[PDB]
Structures are given as C-alpha cells and as structure tokens.
A paper describes a structure:
The CDKs and their corresponding cyclins form specific complexes including the Cdk7/CycH/Mat1 complex, which is part of the general transcription factor TFIIH, the Cdk8/CycC kinase module of the Mediator complex, the Cdk9/CycT complex that constitutes the active form of the positive transcription elongation factor (P-TEFb) and the recently discovered metazoan kinases Cdk12 and Cdk13, which both associate with Cyclin K (CycK). The transcription-associated kinases phosphorylate serine residues within the hepta-repeat sequence Y1S2P3T4S5P6S7 of Rpb1, the largest subunit of RNA Pol II. At 1,490 and 1,512 amino acids, respectively, human Cdk12 and Cdk13 are unusually large kinases that share 43% sequence identity and harbour a central kinase domain. The full-length recombinant Cdk12 kinase expressed from insect cells instead showed no kinase activity, indicating either the loss of activation signals or autoregulatory motifs in regions adjacent to the kinase domain. Together, these data suggest that Cdk12 is a promiscuous CTD kinase that has a preference for Ser5 phosphorylations.
We have determined the crystal structure of the human Cdk12/CycK pair in complex with ADP and aluminium fluoride as a transition state mimic at 2.2 Å resolution. Two Cdk12/CycK heterodimers form the asymmetrical unit cell of the protein crystal, whereas no crystallographic density was observed for the substrate peptide but only for the AlF3 transition state mimic. Cdk12 is in the active kinase conformation as characterized by the orientation of the αC helix, also known as the PITAIRE helix (PITALRE in Cdk9). Phospho-T893 within the activation segment is clearly visible in the electron density map and interacts with R858 and R882. The presence of ADP and AlF3 in the crystallization condition led to the incorporation of ADP·AlF3 and two magnesium ions, MgI and MgII, in the crystal structure. We show that Cdk12 contains an additional C-terminal helix, αK, outside the canonical kinase fold that makes multiple water-mediated interactions with both the N- and C-terminal lobes as well as the ribose of the bound nucleotide. A 1038DCHEL motif reaches out to the N-terminal lobe, the ATP ribose and the C-terminal lobe, and interacts with the bound nucleotide by multiple water-mediated contacts. The H1040 Nε2 amine interacts directly with the N3 nitrogen of the adenine base at 3.0 Å. The structure thereby resembles a ‘closed conformation’ for the bound nucleotide in which the free exchange of ADP for ATP is impaired by the intra-molecular contacts of the C-terminal helix formed with the kinase core domain. The approach of the C-terminal helix αK towards the kinase active site is enabled by the presence of a small glycine (G822) in helix αD, which allows for association of this helix with the bound nucleotide.
Author numbering: 716 to 798, 807 to 1046
Write the structure that this text describes.
Amino acid sequence: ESDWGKRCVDKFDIIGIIGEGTYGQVYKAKDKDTGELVALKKVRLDNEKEGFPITAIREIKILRQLIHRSVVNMKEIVTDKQDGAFYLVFEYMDHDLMGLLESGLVHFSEDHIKSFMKQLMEGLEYCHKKNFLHRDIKCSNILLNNSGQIKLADFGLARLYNSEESRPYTNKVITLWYRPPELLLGEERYTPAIDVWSCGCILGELFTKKPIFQANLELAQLELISRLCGSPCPAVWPDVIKLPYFNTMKPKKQYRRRLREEFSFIPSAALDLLDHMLTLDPSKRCTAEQTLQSDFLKDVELSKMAPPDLPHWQDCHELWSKK
Ligand SMILES: Nc1ncnc2c1ncn2[C@@H]1O[C@H](COP(=O)(O)OP(=O)(O)O)[C@@H](O)[C@H]1O
Ligand SMILES: [Mg+2]
Ligand SMILES: [Mg+2]
Ligand SMILES: [Mg+2]
C-alpha cells in the first residue's frame, strides 16, 4: 500500500500505552482486518507553533529509506478521524533491551549475546552503508521480539553523513552514558564510529547487566571512560590534541587501559570485540563491518539459534520498567 495517510486509526484496536514518545504517546494496538499486532507512534499536530513537527519529518524521511531485517520498518501512516494526529505504524515488538534488563526476568547467555549483537551490527552496518548516522543508540532503542529477533529503533536523531568529505555535525548527540570520547571532547566532524562506541557499551552491558559508564556530567563521564579504557593521549590518539576540550577536560591521573582485566570474566572472543569497539581513537575503532568479521560474530548462524527465554506474558518496555 503506497497510499499513506488516509487510512484511519480506528481500523486499529488500541490495547495500551507502551511508551512515552517525543511527539506523542506510543501504543500497542491490533489491526482489525489482519489481526496483526503493531506499535503506533502518535504525532500530535495541534498546539504546535510550527505544525507538523520538523522532528517527525526528519525521522519519517529517514525511516522511508531503510529496509532491513534488523531495522525498524514503518508500515504506514494513519490518521485520526476527520471532518488531529497522525500515527506512524510499526510491527509490534514485544520488548526493548532496557525493559528486559530491568525486569530481572531474563538472563542472556553467550549464545543469546552473539545473536543479539550479530543482528544489531548488521542493522547498524546497513544504516552506515546508506550514509546514516543513528546518534541515539541505547538499550531503550533496541527492540526485541519473543522470536528473539532484534530491531534497531528510534531514528529521531539520525542524519545523513557525508562519506566523501568531512562535514560539521551537531556534538551533543547520544545519551551521555553511551556517548563516545571524541564527542565529550567536542568533536563536530565525527563519523559512524560514534555509533560503534554506543554498541560496545551495549555489548559490555549485556555481560554485566548494568550500564558500564554511569556519570551525571560530561567531565565525570570522561573520567569514568578514562578509568577503564585509559586516558586519551596522543600516543594512542594523535588527533586528540586538536579537539576543543582536551585541555579543559582532562582525566584525573594518566590511566592505563585495564579493560581486559575488568572484563576478564567475559569470554575471550567477546572481549576482543569489546576491546576494539571501545578503542578511544575513532579512526582505530572497528567499523560495523569489522565487528561482523570478528571471531565472536563471524560464524554465528542466525537460523541455527534458539530463541532466548523471554517472557511471553509480560511486555518488557522501558515505560513498564519505570512503572
Ligand atoms: N515498533 C515498536 N514495537 C514495540 N515497542 C516499541 C516500538 N517502537 C517503540 N517502542 C517502545 O516505545 C518506546 C519509545 O519509542 P521511540 O521510537 O524510542 O521514541 P522516543 O524515544 O523518541 O520517545 C521505546 O523505548 C520502545 O520501548
Ligand atoms: Mg527512544
Ligand atoms: Mg527518541
Ligand atoms: Mg574485531
């Protein structure tokens, strides 16, 4: 169906609110004609000074350019009854990574992690190849269904990136805990590397079940990053002295990288990949394509993997986890 925007929201049965969204609520709902479960993201128009939100417009333009298994795919746009909000429509996903981790109902085996990472990275690689930067990777933006299928979501901060030559981009992107060192240090002409750093944080978080860098503020965050990955310095990161806040934001002692010691409990192949993902110099950081060729992922056959043990009776989304 090419003919978007005309079908009515009342063709869906609204089951319940699953999210609080930037420009409207997110609903679980059911298709009355097909019986299919969907998520509806509301876009409210009324009382907006500038009408339909430029934010949703950007996301819509990006979503429409991406078709991949591991990336959220918007089915149609529907309207409130007329004569007024729109609703973006997506395949319903039972959970997101944050809600699950927080539920305390789940445990992820090495095999589960491999499978999740394989799917996340293939989604990410696809986006990068299309010249999109995600810029908001975090647990709450990764969706998982009961069949154990992963989808990268929330393209609300994504943008096109110039692969041919460098361009200046917005710096305060990515929630702080997942934000890479070059951004904390004020880079504006950054790269798809920023997203891979976010993913290495997820990977580590899957093993410890807690976000691996948890600070309030930027300087504090850099210090925590320094403590694990080593201080940023020219010896490992020559270009670092060119960054705006390098002198201003300086860690507290000149730390050694102790990533491999701190995460020794992790399997060695996972740990290689983690090491590479959390490499401070974005130009040395592995690409999304590189992660897929790693020991940890290269031989993961998805068809041959058992779905994980996820609750089929509770939908573990981030909003739920708070309530
Ligand atoms: N297609 C979907 N299926 C199931 N749940 C979803 C879907 N899209 C979003 N959600 C839930 O709604 C929450 C908000 O969605 P999102 O796209 O992340 O908007 P935002 O973070 O900008 O408010 C997500 O954390 C997720 O838990
Ligand atoms: Mg989100
Ligand atoms: Mg968002
Ligand atoms: Mg590697």
